[PDB]
Amino acid sequence: RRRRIILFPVPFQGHINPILQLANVLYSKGFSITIFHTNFNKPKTSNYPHFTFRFILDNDPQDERISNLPTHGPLAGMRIPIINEHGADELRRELELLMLASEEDEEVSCLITDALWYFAQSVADSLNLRRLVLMTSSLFNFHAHVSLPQFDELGYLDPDDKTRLEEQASGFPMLKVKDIKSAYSNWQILKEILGKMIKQTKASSGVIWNSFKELEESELETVIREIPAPSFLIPLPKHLTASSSSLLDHDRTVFQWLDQQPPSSVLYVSFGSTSEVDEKDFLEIARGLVDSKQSFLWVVRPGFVKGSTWVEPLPDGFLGERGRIVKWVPQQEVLAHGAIGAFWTHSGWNSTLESVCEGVPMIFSDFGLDQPLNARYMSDVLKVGVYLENGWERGEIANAIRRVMVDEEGEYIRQNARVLKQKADVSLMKGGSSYESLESLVSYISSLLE
Ligand SMILES: C=C1C[C@@]23CC[C@H]4[C@@](C)(CCC[C@@]4(C)C(=O)O[C@@H]4O[C@H](CO)[C@@H](O)[C@H](O)[C@H]4O)[C@@H]2CC[C@]1(O[C@@H]1O[C@H](CO)[C@@H](O)[C@H](O)[C@H]1O)C3
Numbered sequence: 337r338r339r340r341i342i343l344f345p346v347p348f349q350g351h352i353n354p355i356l357q358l359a360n361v362l363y364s365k366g367f368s369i370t371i372f373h374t375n376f377n378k379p380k381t382s383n384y385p386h387f388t389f390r391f392i393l394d395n396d397p398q399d400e401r402i403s404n405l406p407t408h409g410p411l412a413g414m415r416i417p418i419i420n421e422h423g424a425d426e427l428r429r430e431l432e433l434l435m436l437a438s439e440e441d442e443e444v445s446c447l448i449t450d451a452l453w454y455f456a457q458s459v460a461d462s463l464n465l466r467r468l469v470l471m472t473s474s475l476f477n478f479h480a481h482v483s484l485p486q487f488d489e490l491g492y493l494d495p496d497d498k499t500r501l502e503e504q505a506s507g508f509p510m511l512k513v514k515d516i517k518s519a520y521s522n523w524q525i526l527k528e529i530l531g532k533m534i535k536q537t538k539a540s541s542g543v544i545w546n547s548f549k550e551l552e553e554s555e556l557e558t559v560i561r562e563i564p565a566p567s568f569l570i571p572l573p574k575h576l577t578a579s580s581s582s583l584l585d586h587d588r589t590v591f592q593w594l595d596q597q598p599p600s601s602v603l604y605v606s607f608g609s610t611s612e613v614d615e616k617d618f619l620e621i622a623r624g625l626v627d628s629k630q631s632f633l634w635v636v637r638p639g640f641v642k643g644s645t646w647v648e649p650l651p652d653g654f655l656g657e658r659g660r661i662v663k664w665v666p667q668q669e670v671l672a673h674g675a676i677g678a679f680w681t682h683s684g685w686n687s688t689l690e691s692v693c694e695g696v697p698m699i700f701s702d703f704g705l706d707q708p709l710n711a712r713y714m715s716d717v718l719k720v721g722v723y724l725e726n727g728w729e730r731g732e733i734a735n736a737i738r739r740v741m742v743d744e745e746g747e748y749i750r751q752n753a754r755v756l757k758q759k760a761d762v763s764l765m766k767g768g769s770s771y772e773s774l775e776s777l778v779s780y781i782s783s784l785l786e
Pocket residue numbers: 549556566567568569767768769770772773774775776777779780
């Protein structure tokens with residue numbers, strides 16, 4: 337292969353997944369692939385015999401700054417600003433080492449990083465290496481991020497202010513103030529990071545968005561205005577599932593059980609790869625699921641319940657005939673199964689986009705960051721689900737599950753989800769927005785060294 341691309345993901349499930357999907361898409365277009373990855377949260381490299389992995393940044397002896405960080409929960413993500421602040425030298429060494437060891441007939445076309453590795457732009461510039469960015473969150477979120485200075489001066493980022501929570505955001509009517517407070521809160525660390533992420537995204541040679549035009553058409557002018565480099569909208573879950581990059585073992589016994597269910601009769605429930613709840617809320621969710629009277633498959637990741645290894649507070653047999661709890665599944669493959677009628681999601685972008693691409697309507701909860709914005713956009717703009725925007729109460733949970741899955745009143749939501757899937761499929765056909773994005777990305781990358 338004449339042209340190599342180096343990809344560098346952020347080492348969490350929701351960032352590794354789209355990077356490795358992208359890597360596969362690019363591999364199928366004729367590029368050779370090297371993945372730079374931390375030892376921390378590494379995927380199974382034996383699932384990717386066609387990729388070269390190079391492990392960087394936390395090899396032994398480990399950096400004192402990284403070493404003692406926990407491997408789960410809130411503070412595991414501190415690896416991100418820490419690597420941004422201290423990783424440049426190593427990244428440069430690793431890139432050079434690879435460029436120096438390459439064959440005569442092989443060139444490195446570009447580096448593709450997660451947008452959150454904003455430090456990588458200066459490193460790539462210092463080597464005369466083009467950097468492209470993969471955004472793993474939505475165009476709508478980007479629009480909100482660039483609007484932060486307006487939100488700041490309007491008073492929305494003061495958490496002591498608890499007025500106007502249910503009002504539309506001034507100059508940004510698609511959101512309510514409470515959505516902005518949940519997304520950004522007071523967090524200075526987030527403000528700093530988003531600021532740098534945005535600045536170095538604008539300075540990059542191109543931006544790949546895990547999305548499609550017909551999903552976020554209202555947000556496209558903002559991106560074209562804010563980012564001078566080309567943007568490419570490719571909905572990665574339509575090209576392939578992220579099964580190979582799973583960091584946990586799959587419970588595939590779920591498929592035998594799904595095969596015993598009537599069509600569209602199962603609620604799939606999963607709150608993603610990093611979320612956690614109090615014991616009280618875990619129990620309220622379980623009761624809502626039971627009260628709904630619908631069959632459900634609930635992925636509860638070990639560590640999801642604060643206080644318990646897995647699901648010890650749950651009484652033995654509490655889920656009845658109708659419910660099953662597992663640790664981890666191949667989520668997109670589950671969402672593609674005929675038994676699934678709805679998806680109760682935490683509104684992480686990969687999960688939301690996967691559900692959209694499989695035509696599965698949603699119930700939304702959120703745990704902050706981009707999640708409330710994704711929930712709001714999907715529930716109010718696209719209208720492909722119901723947003724549980726006021727906590728966990730069994731009655732509310734039960735009503736929402738029933739509305740999406742069974743009520744005649746929710747038929748429009750189910751239909752909206754079916755049609756949105758079809759638009760995703762059409763976008764991949766010749767002349768479609770996604771097809772043209774991918775063709776242009778390949779031509780653009782191939783032109784970078786010329
Ligand atoms: C560099 C490129 C990336 C690029 C990717 C598609 C993308 C967009 C047009 C930006 C907006 C979103 C989106 C998704 C878009 O609306 O896509 C359009 O969606 C329509 C359906 O709604 C389709 O009918 C159109 O055909 C489609 O363009 C973007 C910028 C400029 C662009 O040019 C290309 O540069 C290439 C060289 O790298 C060159 O080979 C092509 O001739 C040239 O078109 C194209």
